[PDB]
Design a protein around this nucleic acid. Sequence first.
RNA 1: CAAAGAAAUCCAGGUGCA
DNA 2: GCACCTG
DNA 3: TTCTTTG
Length: 596
Amino acid sequence: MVHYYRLSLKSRQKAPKIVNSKYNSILNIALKNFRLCKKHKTKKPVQILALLQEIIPKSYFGTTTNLKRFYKVVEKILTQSSFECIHLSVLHKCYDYDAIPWLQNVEPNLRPKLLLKHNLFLLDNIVKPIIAFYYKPIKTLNGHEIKFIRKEEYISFESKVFHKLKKMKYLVEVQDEVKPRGVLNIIPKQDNFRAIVSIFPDSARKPFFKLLTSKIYKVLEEKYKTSGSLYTCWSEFTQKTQGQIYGIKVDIRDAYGNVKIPVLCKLIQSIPTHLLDSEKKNFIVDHISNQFVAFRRKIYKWNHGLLQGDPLSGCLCELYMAFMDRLYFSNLDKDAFIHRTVDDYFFCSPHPHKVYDFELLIKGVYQVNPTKTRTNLPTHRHPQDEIPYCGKIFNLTTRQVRTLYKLPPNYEIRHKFKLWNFNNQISDDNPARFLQKAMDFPFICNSFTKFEFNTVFNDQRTVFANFYDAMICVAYKFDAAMMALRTSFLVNDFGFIWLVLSSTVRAYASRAFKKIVTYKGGKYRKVTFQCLKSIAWRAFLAVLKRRTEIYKGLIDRIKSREKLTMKFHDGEVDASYFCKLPEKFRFVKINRKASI
RNA sequence: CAAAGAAAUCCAGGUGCA
DNA sequence: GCACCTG
DNA sequence: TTCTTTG
Ligand SMILES: Nc1nc2c(ncn2[C@H]2C[C@H](O)[C@@H](COP(=O)(O)OP(=O)(O)OP(=O)(O)O)O2)c(=O)[nH]1
Ligand SMILES: [Ca+2]
């Protein structure tokens, strides 16, 4: 039933001085060296694997190659993603049992069991504790990526921010007997920070909060102009605009923090009575006026707009922005396009000065985050025709929409994928089931929308490009799962791989084909299932070719068994885009190596 | 002083999947 | 329930 | 880098 070992540090344990009789005495040496290792702690940087080599004697491992099996697991811990696991059997399979000196008295029957127990003891009582002793795992919020930060460096960063917040009077200490609603967490955010409350899990008032949220959204639906969907707005705008489109995307700085609580309170109190009780109005006003958080053994009032991480802040920020929109961003020209997602505005017009006027208007009403502004206005510093907005890239010149992929340089793309689920575990002899979950649709489904696959404003050229890019992601997930099979399942025979990949190619082409038919428009010429299959195969080939030694036989079947010919039925499509990794995808890191 | 342990990743909405 | 996305 | 709780 229990197949997985979690890589996360939370599973660590307090080590004893010695082990009991049924554990072998060899661990006492590592325990002794472990305590001695901490007495030598230096601010100077440390390499964990080097430290373990001073802690765990070679004689524990027997052969130096048996040591490598264990340390490969540690290296995975040092480079883990959120939720990542390994198979427990990795801790005892294929070890050289004849060469482990402290097992030579145990019967051949009982050896693997004992090695699992001692390896687990080392990992849970020495390895993970020594990592946690030196480092703090920071969840970076780019996929499931984790970065390990020296504790001194993390505390120093956190103390800078906390001092700012007190100095600005955003955080004000109250008496320690005031009850807080959660714990303040300062998360690193690309050289900046995100102050959130981690809300205390209170399941008693969750139904009440859902009720209040539903009430606020009914106020919004009933009393405020409901914007068309982003897709409908772009479709109608591109259809009626004949010239060059000009446009701007802007982002509000510190959006929740700059909600003016006195204005929001007045707004809530003016909601009509049939839409919100007097008690519920008073409850919300009291709720957002008295925000109390715990931090480092003290209790603070939060006095900077709405607390990020409180469940009610979401619908209340929307209420505030809808009000701002009614006051300031309504009755705009019929010519123009506008759409707002939370604090992000996308404004376009065929008239450049109207885009300029909108920028001036938005900058008078809000404080803008100027690092996030994107525009093709010629007067601006670095104009560009591709505007990122709501996870898509809108090309103002060609009117084409492409999926936005967030892949910084030297980003390990495996951090995007959740290959292991501790609640739904898969046996080490069921590699097929592991791959089946890895190739399921939902993780990539946001690249399979009407934005990518319509032929209303998108040409076939960009429909095919969107599909190829999505299948590049799928192929990278397949590769990441394959790495997991060989290092954790220890799969020897890979016969079934050809079929899963064939079924996966066909399932994804079939999903794209249906979306293309559903969202067909005037730019549709001819899209064939066969052309989509060929594109999907070429995406896999482009990714598999990054490890041609491992995938040589697989690459060779693809080329000898599958038709890779692409009848685009559109002379504007460029075939060479489908013969190589797109540039955004060409530089992602695919080899994991510990740095700490 | 020594050791041990702790220093808390949350929320709304969306796509959907099956 | 799952696993992605937006802010 | 702090805070408890125990040698
Ligand atoms: N609880 C929570 N709220 C979030 C998260 N991401 C965004 N929000 C909410 C609160 C932010 O104020 C608002 C705008 O999102 P941003 O990502 O633009 O952050 P912010 O505007 O706070 O700061 P900025 O100056 O743009 O870096 O959306 C999140 O991960 N957790
Ligand atoms: Ca913002």
